[PDB]
Design a protein around this nucleic acid. Structure first.
Lengths: 143, 262, 206
RNA sequence: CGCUACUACCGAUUGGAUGGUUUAGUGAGGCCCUCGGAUCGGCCCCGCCGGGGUGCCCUGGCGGAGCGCUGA
RNA sequence: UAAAGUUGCUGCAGUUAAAAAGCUCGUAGUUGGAUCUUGGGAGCGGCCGUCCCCUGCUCGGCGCCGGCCCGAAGCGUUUACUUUGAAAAAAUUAGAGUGUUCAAAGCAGGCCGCCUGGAUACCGCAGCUAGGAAUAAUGGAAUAGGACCGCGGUUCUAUUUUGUUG
RNA sequence: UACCUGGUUGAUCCUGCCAGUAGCAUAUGCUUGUCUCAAAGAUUAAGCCAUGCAUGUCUAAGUACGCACGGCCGGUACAGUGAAACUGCGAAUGGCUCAUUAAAUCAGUUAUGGUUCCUUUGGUCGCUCGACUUGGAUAACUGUGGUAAUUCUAGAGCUAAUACAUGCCGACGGGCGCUGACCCCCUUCGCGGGGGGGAUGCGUGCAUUUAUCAGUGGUGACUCUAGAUAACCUCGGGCCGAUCGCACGCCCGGCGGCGACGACCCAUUCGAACGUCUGCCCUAUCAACUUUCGAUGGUAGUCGCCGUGCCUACCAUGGUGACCACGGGUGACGGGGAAUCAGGGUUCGAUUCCGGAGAGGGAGCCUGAGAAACGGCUACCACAUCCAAGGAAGGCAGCAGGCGCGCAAAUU
RNA sequence: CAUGUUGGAACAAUGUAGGUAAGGGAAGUCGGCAAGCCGGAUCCGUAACUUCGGGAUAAGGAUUGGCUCUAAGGGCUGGCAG
């Protein structure tokens, strides 16, 4: 189910050796008014880098982007698309700066083309400095 | 650049000293102290250019090393000591007391006061702290860490303290309708009443401040310093009383000054 | 020396970086401690900001906490059993953080004797002839014996810990960093975490 | 096509000369680790007896080790 | 560098002066028809010219007696656009004052101890913020896994309450 | 000031360049009376340097027994000066140059809830049952010496401290959490029972670890700040004052003022350091690049001041690119700015302000809060000095000045 | 099976058949003839030219013993146990 790894996956807040005659969870609210999902409270997953169940503090820039690649382990590549202005030719030009965001498994059902609102935190890895705070799927919704 | 810098170039000095560039390359880099390098007067600048007791820098050496100047009732003998906002400078021999209060333009005014007015000063709380054994501490804007302050004196309030003891004499809470002075930004050294503080979670909060002539300017919460209640302040105010009369209206008074008194 | 810089290596795109400055000091690497289990040897490092950092090269006696019964005792470290990171840190018996060890069992059995007035270990029929320890299992009042008779109902130990008291050595997990602190502080394994590390020990051996 | 003047081109020469990065080999010096032990001090029970409590003994003028243990 | 409208966004040329691929398909790129609260009122300016509207359920009163509403605050399709504010080192430039004897300058000076300056703008974009909703993108109900309801149950944890004591 | 003129022809109208025209900032030619500002070895050679200087420092307040001076005549040690010299702070600022470096540097904007910080400033400096000054060297000195030579140091003989060490009177009488001889009391038919008093021994205040009773205060949000209990306290140790001189007064061997110096820690100030968003010149005769010897992620450590493939073991197969990746060039340090401009642009920015980098090329480190420091060391590599041939010594892209190089740039 | 159709004793020259040589290293010679160097495997790296198949084991590098360990790769019985 969980703990397929070499070391025991647990949370460093809870203690899970109570004496007898359903272990509890460590959740938190992220701040700036974001609804912490049901999957991060009723869920069983252990994740170090999750901003609901794990240890990370969201502070600084809240950005948005559209999901591109989902082939990594608990990480996704989003695309930010913007228009750079040139003063000489009084027009714009399409650019993009696609970035690597950490995705918590409290977002259980995500596909490509979804719009994720991501928050700045400390560097998680070499090129990961953002966490998905909410997922807002595009047009369609059903088939 | 492998350690802390010790010189200050006269060109790259804070703008509100008014230091003429043709004199020297360097300006008085203020000694580390209770206030920041940008937003403070060093002692030499106040005692040389503003008062003209000293013609040179060796003369503020000869003044300070006879120890007549006492900053906040404490005898300071360092020519580059950073005297910031609301810090009261006292010359004991002359019998003159000067409070450092911001001008209409955003400069430090040569504002004289009574000896009664000298014994107390106002300090904005920067944070509260819980000490080593549930001792509430309280750090001000001049690094004053007062211990056992009143449980109602919170984060952004203002405390009137006595200088002899260093205890809290009285306090003012951050109320909408209290007087305040903007101590930074574009609106530097204007007195007005608070109408609303815009709550932006994460980023800085902005306060809308209305002066007596009926003019609404906004600023960050970092620069606002509450100084009294309603219409009357707790401190002596300088000439003008931080109205900020506009460049056309200044020429309208400068006309009448040299036309009437001639 | 050993650089800890992030600019000596490639970009995200996969292009070779150019160095704009050479090795700075605040980019600093010291060689590892590799803290073996032996008679206590600790060196000190003068670090950035003139602070200390204690390089435990050997330490034999740690300080482990029985989180369930709540008693922390300065206990002897004996043998290393598991290491999640490197299998060659169990062959060369080193002490790093989150490393599973066998600690002495007698300072916890002593406390369980004193606090509850029960035995732990003690084989079928194996009773005490010199008579020192067994004077702790008898002779209370008829009303402070009644104090102890509240503790005895909520006494019974976990049956997976029963064996680690009879063998005389407890599976413990180090929590501090012997390289940095000059200490081997940890906690005794019980519950699901114990069962997990018991399987991973037992899995290979056979 | 024949004379002169100048500028580029192909060209056998397994051409030549300067750099730049770098594979191998050897590898100075510093740093860490395990040692090491040139040396320099403690301390002890005896011997000649002081000096003072009554042979115990508080400190010393000295010779001597099993260099006894111990520090740098 | 200007003259160079002889490198062109403003702003050039391509029948013959130099120049349109031999033809069509075609992916990025670029660009994309029309369509959705408009009139009319309403008091006061002097037949006409402004204000306000086709929005809602923690906290004070001008209060009446499970309540008849206005005052401060958590809130309400997304973005570009424009408007204002914040925040933005001086120096330089633009500029205000001032007879360095004029000027370029500089930050000083003026009146018989006093008075008085040492302003002010500009500071592309990117981020922050609050108005405006035309223009241009974008969202919603069509296997109804629809909006508004008041209803009837399935389970968990606080407190308003069980005289102390479980 | 939103501008044009000459030249293809026998002559004409065009396209189109060439040539004139004005500014600017380098060189140079000829010429020169006054006065006021004033750039100046950047371009080529981040080429080489003889000589001199450029970083030293004491008040009443760490340490004076130099008679080098000196007041006193005989004072219970010490008047005042005083070279040294040891202590402890500075030398990591400044100054110079632009060699490298193209999302790097740097600019605006934000994060440190992810760290460190000498000093300044303000707190705390009898909260911990638990000694009227304690050890023994060592410099200057004295007296002996070695080498041609260095800001070389040896052997011997003294003596100091805020250097190096060691340590306790006081507060001190207790208070508080386990452990428990026995004590107050009846209930019921004696056992069960409902609450208190206590002879003890132990543990005692801020760092490492784990726990819950919890969560006094705060945050947009903490595994926050505090509070409680069980242990640990690194011989290469967290403090818990053997320091100094101004006036010295109270009281019958105690009390007391005014300041230096010093101190673990907290909060400041100066910062620094790593990260967030967006932004750059030419090039396709550079179209795919990265990854076994980390490339992009996961996990658990190591190391670091801290976050992180920074590094190591296991895994996963990712990461970037026509919206120009990757590779290459640049007479490329970046920006504030500068020249020219109707309006839009074009070109320049080594150059006094901010940030960066380097000290002939690389590499490594000692000390310190802070250098990977070069007016500090340790090696190699070029260049080069004195030599009695054994050995020492050196880093002007600091201020002057000399050589070279040049179209090109100042007084030892 | 009895050393190839015989034994014994010596250890001269010159032979035939093996080997090794300091320093140099083709100067020897018609001519590197003869001899010598290289050699297996595993991991790197691989040019001109090309009939695009090759060239190619191009050229050029590194490692290799013994011992004690770890890791991964399978079947039978009613995501697990034996």
């Amino acid at each position: 189910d969980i703990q397929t790894e070499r070391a025991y996956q647990k949370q460093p807040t809870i203690f899970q050796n109570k004496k007898r005659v359903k272990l509890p969870r460590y959740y938190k609210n992220i701040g700036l008014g974001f609804k912490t999902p049901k999957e991060a409270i009723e869920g069983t997953y252990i994740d170090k880098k999750c901003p609901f169940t794990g240890n990370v503090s969201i502070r600084g820039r809240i950005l948005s982007g559209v999901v591109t690649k989902m082939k990594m382990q608990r990480t996704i590549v989003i695309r930010r698309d913007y228009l750079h202005y040139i003063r000489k030719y009084n027009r714009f030009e399409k650019r993009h700066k696609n970035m690597s965001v950490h995705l918590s498994p409290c977002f259980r059902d995500v596909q490509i083309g979804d719009i994720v609102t991501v928050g700045e935190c400390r560097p998680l890895s070499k090129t990961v400095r953002f966490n998905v705070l909410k997922v807002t799927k595009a047009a369609g919704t059903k088939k | 650049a492998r350690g802390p810098k010790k010189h200050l170039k006269r060109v790259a000095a804070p703008k509100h000293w008014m230091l003429d560039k043709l004199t020297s390359v360097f300006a008085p880099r203020p000694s580390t102290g209770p206030h920041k390098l940008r937003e403070c007067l060093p002692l030499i600048i106040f005692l040389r250019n503003k008062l003209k007791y000293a013609l040179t820098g060796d003369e503020v050496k000869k003044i300070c090393m006879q120890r007549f100047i006492k900053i906040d009732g404490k005898v300071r003998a360092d020519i580059t000591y950073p005297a910031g906002f609301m810090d009261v400078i006292s010359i004991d021999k002359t019998g003159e007391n000067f409070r450092l209060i911001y001008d209409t333009k955003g400069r430090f005014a040569v504002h004289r006061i009574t000896p009664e007015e000298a014994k107390y000063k106002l300090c904005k709380v920067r944070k509260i702290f819980v000490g080593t054994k549930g001792i509430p501490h309280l750090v001000t804007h001049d690094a004053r860490t007062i211990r056992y302050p009143d449980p109602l004196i919170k984060m952004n309030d203002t405390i009137q303290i006595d200088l002899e003891t260093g205890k809290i004499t009285d306090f003012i809470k951050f109320d909408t309708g209290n007087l305040c002075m903007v101590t930074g930004g574009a609106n530097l050294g204007r007195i007005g009443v608070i109408t609303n503080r815009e709550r932006h979670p994460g980023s800085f909060d902005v306060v809308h401040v209305k002066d007596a002539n009926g003019n609404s300017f906004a600023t960050r919460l970092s620069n606002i310093f509450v100084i009294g209640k309603g219409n009357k302040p707790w401190i002596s105010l300088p000439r003008g009383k931080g109205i900020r009369l506009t460049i056309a209206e200044e020429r309208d008074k400068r006309l009448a000054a040299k036309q009437s008194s001639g | 020396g050993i650089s800890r810089d992030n600019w000596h290596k490639r970009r995200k795109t996969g292009g070779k970086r150019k160095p704009y400055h050479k090795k700075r000091k605040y980019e600093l690497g010291r060689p590892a401690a590799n803290t073996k289990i032996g008679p206590r040897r600790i060196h000190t490092v003068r670090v950035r900001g003139g602070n200390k950092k204690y390089r435990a090269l050997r330490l034999d006696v740690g300080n482990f906490s029985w989180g369930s019964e709540c008693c922390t005792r300065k206990t002897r470290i004996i043998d290393v059993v598991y290491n999640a990171s490197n299998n060659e840190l169990v062959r060369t018996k080193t002490l790093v953080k989150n490393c599973i060890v066998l600690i002495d069992s007698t300072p916890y059995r002593q406390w369980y004797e004193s606090h509850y007035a029960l035995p732990l270990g003690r084989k079928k029929g194996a009773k005490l002839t010199p008579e020192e320890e067994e004077i702790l299992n008898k002779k209370r009042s008829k009303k402070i014996q009644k104090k102890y008779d509240e503790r005895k109902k909520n006494a019974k130990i976990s049956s997976l810990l029963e064996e680690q008291f009879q063998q005389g050595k407890l599976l413990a997990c180090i929590a501090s960093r012997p390289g940095q602190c000059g200490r081997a502080d940890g906690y005794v394994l019980e519950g699901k975490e114990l069962e997990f590390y018991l399987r991973k020990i037992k899995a290979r051996k056979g």
